[PDB]
Amino acid sequence: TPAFNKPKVELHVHLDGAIKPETILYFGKKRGIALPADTVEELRNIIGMDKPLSLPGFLAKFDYYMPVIAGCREAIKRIAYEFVEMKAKEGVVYVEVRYSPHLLANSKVDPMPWNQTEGDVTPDDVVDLVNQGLQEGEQAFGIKVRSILCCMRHQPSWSLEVLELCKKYNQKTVVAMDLAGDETIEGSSLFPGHVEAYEGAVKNGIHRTVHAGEVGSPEVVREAVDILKTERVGHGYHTIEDEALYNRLLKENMHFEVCPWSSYLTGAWDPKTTHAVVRFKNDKANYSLNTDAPLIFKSTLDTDYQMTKKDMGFTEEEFKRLNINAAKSSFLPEEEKKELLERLYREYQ
Numbered sequence: 001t002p003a004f005n006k007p008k009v010e011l012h013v014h015l016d017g018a019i020k021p022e023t024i025l026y027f028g029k030k031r032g033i034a035l036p037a038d039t040v041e042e043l044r045n046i047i048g049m050d051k052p053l054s055l056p057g058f059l060a061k062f063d064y065y066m067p068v069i070a071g072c073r074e075a076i077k078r079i080a081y082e083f084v085e086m087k088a089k090e091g092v093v094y095v096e097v098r099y100s101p102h103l104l105a106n107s108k109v110d111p112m113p114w115n116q117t118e119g120d121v122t123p124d125d126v127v128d129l130v131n132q133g134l135q136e137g138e139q140a141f142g143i144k145v146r147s148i149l150c151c152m153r154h155q156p157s158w159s160l161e162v163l164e165l166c167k168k169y170n171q172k173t174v175v176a177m178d179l180a181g182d183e184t185i186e187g188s189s190l191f192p193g194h195v196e197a198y199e200g201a202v203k204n205g206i207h208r209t210v211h212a213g214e215v216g217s218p219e220v221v222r223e224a225v226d227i228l229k230t231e232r233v234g235h236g237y238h239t240i241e242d243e244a245l246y247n248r249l250l251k252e253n254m255h256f257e258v259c260p261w262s263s264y265l266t267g268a269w270d271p272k273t274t275h276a277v278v279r280f281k282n283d284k285a286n287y288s289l290n291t292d293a294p295l296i297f298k299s300t301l302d303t304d305y306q307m308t309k310k311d312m313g314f315t316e317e318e319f320k321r322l323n324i325n326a327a328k329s330s331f332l333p334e335e336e337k338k339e340l341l342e343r344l345y346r347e348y349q
């Protein structure tokens, strides 16, 4: 009984947020790097979230394990291959994985993430390494996987390079640019680096997606849409607070990348108020149902389906509808997007 035992499309999930506790454990020992536990189970309890934390609270969990992956070619390549494997088993036929190339490098990055020591794993190298892992998993498990590079809110110095990385690796997996991180940083959307990287994404035809409204007010969504030119909005739960904005976006067919479980666990969604996804569903909005960071929410793609099904009252007709909208809104080239639509319509028959 998996809520939606049919092909799915995932548009919103972070690679460094969907690693197997087993792989984390393996490289800790292998590199002699300290973890907060030496058992996959207790490692799941230190990293995982039980009840709602906050955004900065959730973001902190990465500290427990990122140091173990970063700077290790074998590790970056392996988590990528293993991610496809994970998604294949969830019955996902198309996925867009996102991650920050800088937070995994150890050379040519400033400031040095995780107190690393100069190495040879350059930000470019991590993109190439992940491509090889993703490509190898596509062949082995038979699914299509594409990737998105993330700009980090607190480091706009990195953004112009994320843009060049998206250009160099255009279609060689890289399909878009994301703006991720601590949304709570006042005006972090307007920082020049971010603004210029996005002005550049536009002139070079690089697809754009931006995390907004997960926790910030509607204005942050307005900045993403109007100033950064997002083609999609990660979360966007607060947009409904501005009926004007919302309705305008609704008429523009703006895609909202929803992650139900996630909103509850980051305190993004107050359990005492109707979920914005119920509105999106009811107004027939363009959106998708995503996992965001399974490792930290101790969740699976099914977790979210099961959630919208039990509470919120979603149905298979709706499940089928949103997955069709997710495919239409993918950052896939037309010919490939058509191919996806065909496949879903076939298996939905």
Ligand SMILES: OC[C@H]1O[C@@H](n2c[nH+]c3c2N=CN[C@H]3O)[C@H](O)[C@@H]1O
Residues within 6 Å of the ligand: 014, 015, 016, 017, 059, 062, 098, 099, 100, 103, 150, 180, 181, 182, 183, 211, 214, 292, 293
């Ligand atoms: O996945 C790349 C990075 O995006 C950030 N991230 C992960 N989950 C989220 C997030 N930023 C904002 N909201 C959340 O959906 C993390 O700092 C991780 O290192």
Ligand SMILES: [Zn+2]
Residues within 6 Å of the ligand: 012, 014, 211, 234, 292
């Ligand atoms: Zn996210």
